[PDB]
Amino acid sequence: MNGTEGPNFYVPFSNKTGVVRSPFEAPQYYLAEPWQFSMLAAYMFLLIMLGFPINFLTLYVTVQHKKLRTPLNYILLNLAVADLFMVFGGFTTTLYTSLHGYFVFGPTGCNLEGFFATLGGEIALWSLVVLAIERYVVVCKPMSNFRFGENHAIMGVAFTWVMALACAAPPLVGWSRYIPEGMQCSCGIDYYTPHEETNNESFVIYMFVVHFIIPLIVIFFCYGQLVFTVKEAAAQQQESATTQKAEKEVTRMVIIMVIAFLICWLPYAGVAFYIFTHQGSDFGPIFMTIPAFFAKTSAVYNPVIYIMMNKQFRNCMVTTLCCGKNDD
Ligand SMILES: *[C@@H]1O[C@H](CO)[C@@H](O[C@@H]2O[C@H](CO)[C@@H](O[C@@H]3O[C@H](CO)[C@@H](O)[C@H](O)[C@@H]3O)[C@H](O)[C@H]2NC(C)=O)[C@H](O)[C@H]1NC(C)=O
Ligand SMILES: *[C@@H]1O[C@H](CO)[C@@H](O[C@@H]2O[C@H](CO)[C@@H](O[C@@H]3O[C@H](CO)[C@@H](O)[C@H](O)[C@@H]3O)[C@H](O)[C@H]2NC(C)=O)[C@H](O)[C@H]1NC(C)=O
Ligand SMILES: CCCCCCCCOCCOCCOCCOCCO
Ligand SMILES: *C/C=C(C)/C=C\C=C(C)\C=C\C1=C(C)CCCC1(C)C
Ligand SMILES: CCCCCCCCCCCC[N+](C)(C)[O-]
Ligand SMILES: [Zn+2]
Incomplete structure (x- = not known):
């Protein structure tokens, strides 16, 4: 066995030496150097200390300024909330888990982190x-x-x-x-075992198709309609050059947000899909650790893209932070 399956876990380490233990029962220091667990911990700590204030700030600044009531403003407020859920609902647990080198909170802790x-x-x-x-x-x-x-x-x-x-x-x-x-x-998600009792196989398919592919199809379609129009379906819409310059700011931003998402999640996506189609194959704990923890920057990059690419949001922020002068 290339890994070690357990009632509710899959350690990507051979148990021929009897060292493997349950990530719910004991530290996993046999998997890698404890300084590496300190690196993850340190990492999560930064994500929490960055993610807490940039999201809250986004949320706060938005609520405070009434003029900030467009669909973008709404979507970014929404992400700010989603991120605060990631930070406080999940990262606190992943941090603490990294410090102890295992899920001392057991499966309930794992559910929080994964959810x-x-x-x-x-x-x-x-x-x-x-x-x-x-x-x-x-x-x-x-x-x-x-x-x-x-x-x-x-x-x-x-x-x-x-x-x-x-x-x-x-x-x-x-x-x-x-x-x-x-x-x-x-x-x-369990890409690691078939565990028919929870119908693993069918969920992973559902996830990749409905919760990855379909959304990308939809966005790709929309991207189609925009390239076309910005080309020859808009010169007939008499889009005044004054609005386009502000509607192109926003369009550019969405495109960047879309690219950032792919940069952030594709690596995780790929390893997950691989593991899923190579269950039992010989891979180490580092194989998924890097992409997974990298993906967790998803809690942070969006408000930052926002602040940096939407002048109106930026100015409101400076205003909020400087009180009065740097509005809505
Ligand atoms: C655990 O990981 C190992 C690789 O580290 C996997 O073992 C590999 O399994 C394939 C078959 O699925 C082996 O291929 C066979 O090679 C022989 C040559 O003797 C050939 O005659 C067969 O037709 C076939 O091509 C491959 O050699 C083997 N690699 C090694 C060196 O072990 C394994 O599948 C993974 N899971 C398991 C079963 O624990
Ligand atoms: C990886 O392999 C190790 C051992 O190679 C597994 O741990 C060992 O598990 C056995 C069987 O559960 C334990 O033996 C116990 O013996 C007493 C006899 O008094 C019996 O009453 C118990 O029911 C049990 O059979 C053994 O203590 C334990 N070895 C130690 C101390 O590490 C280990 O579970 C494997 N990894 C996993 C979690 O899959
Ligand atoms: C230098 C990389 C060459 C290896 C490419 C392998 C392609 C095998 O096709 C499988 C299809 O998977 C989709 C994308 O492929 C990327 C890696 O494939 C591993 C499957 O998860
Ligand atoms: C650090 C913990 C992580 C990354 C745990 C779980 C992540 C998923 C189950 C991710 C699923 C996916 C998302 C969020 C978007 C791209 C496709 C996807 C299905 C891999
Ligand atoms: C529905 C399938 C989606 C799969 C997306 C794959 C993105 C590639 C990311 C790297 C994966 C390559 N590999 C084998 C090292 O994992
Ligand atoms: Zn309306």
Whole structure:
């Protein structure tokens, strides 16, 4: 056996030397150097100390400024909340797990870490869908005399929560399950075992198809409509050069957010898909540790892209932080 399966775990280390233990029962220092566990800990600590203030700040600045009530403003507020859930719901646990080198909080700890990570990632993915569609509607206005206003914004946000929970929750109640990965200090979906009792196989398929591929199809479609229009379907829409310059700011930003997501999550995606199609194969704990922990920057990069690429949000922020002068 290249790894060590247990009732509820899969250590990617051979147990021929009898050293393997359950990531729920004892430290995993046999897996790698303890200074590496300190690196993860240190890492999570930074993510928490960065993620807590940039998200809250985003959330706070948005609420405080009434003029910040467009679909973008709404979507980014939504991410800010999603990220605070990742930070406080998940990262605190992954931090503490890294410090002890195992899930001292047992499977309940693992569920927290896996849930909020999955939730935050998916909320970001589906939010991208809502934005692309909003860019589509606002930049090409295909449907009739329609208004993607505040009302749809709310419906947009609720929508992201629905899809994301459709992915993150089922493994909490019997469809697949959260399971330790890599050095055993973070938890992901079970790509590792078939465990037919929780119908693992069918969940992983559902996840990759509905919670990765489909959303990418939708965004790709929208991206199609925008390239086309910015080309020859907009010169007939008489888009005044004055609005386009502000609607191109926002369009560029969404595109960057989409690229950042791919940069952040594809590596995890690939390893997961690999493991899934090579169960039992010989891979170490480092194979998934790097992509998994890297993906956790998803809790941080969005508000930063926001601050850096949306002048209106930026100015409001400086205003909030400087009190009065640097508004809404
Ligand atoms: C655990 O990992 C090892 C690799 O580290 C996997 O073992 C590999 O298994 C394949 C078959 O699935 C072996 O291929 C066979 O090679 C012989 C040559 O003697 C050939 O006649 C067969 O037709 C076939 O091609 C491969 O050699 C083997 N690698 C080694 C060196 O062990 C294994 O599948 C993984 N899981 C298990 C079973 O523990
Ligand atoms: C990796 O292999 C090691 C041993 O190579 C596994 O740990 C060992 O597990 C055995 C069987 O559970 C333990 O033996 C116990 O013996 C008493 C006899 O009084 C019996 O009453 C128990 O039911 C049990 O059979 C043994 O203590 C333990 N060895 C130690 C101390 O490490 C280990 O479980 C394997 N990794 C995993 C968790 O898959
Ligand atoms: C230098 C990399 C060459 C190895 C490429 C292997 C391609 C095997 O096709 C499998 C299809 O998987 C999708 C993308 O492939 C990337 C790695 O494949 C591993 C499968 O998870
Ligand atoms: C640090 C902990 C992590 C990364 C735990 C779990 C992550 C997932 C189950 C991720 C799922 C996916 C997302 C969020 C978006 C890209 C596709 C996906 C299905 C791999
Ligand atoms: C539905 C399939 C999606 C798979 C996405 C794959 C992205 C590639 C990322 C690196 C994976 C390569 N590998 C084998 C080292 O894991
Ligand atoms: Zn409306």
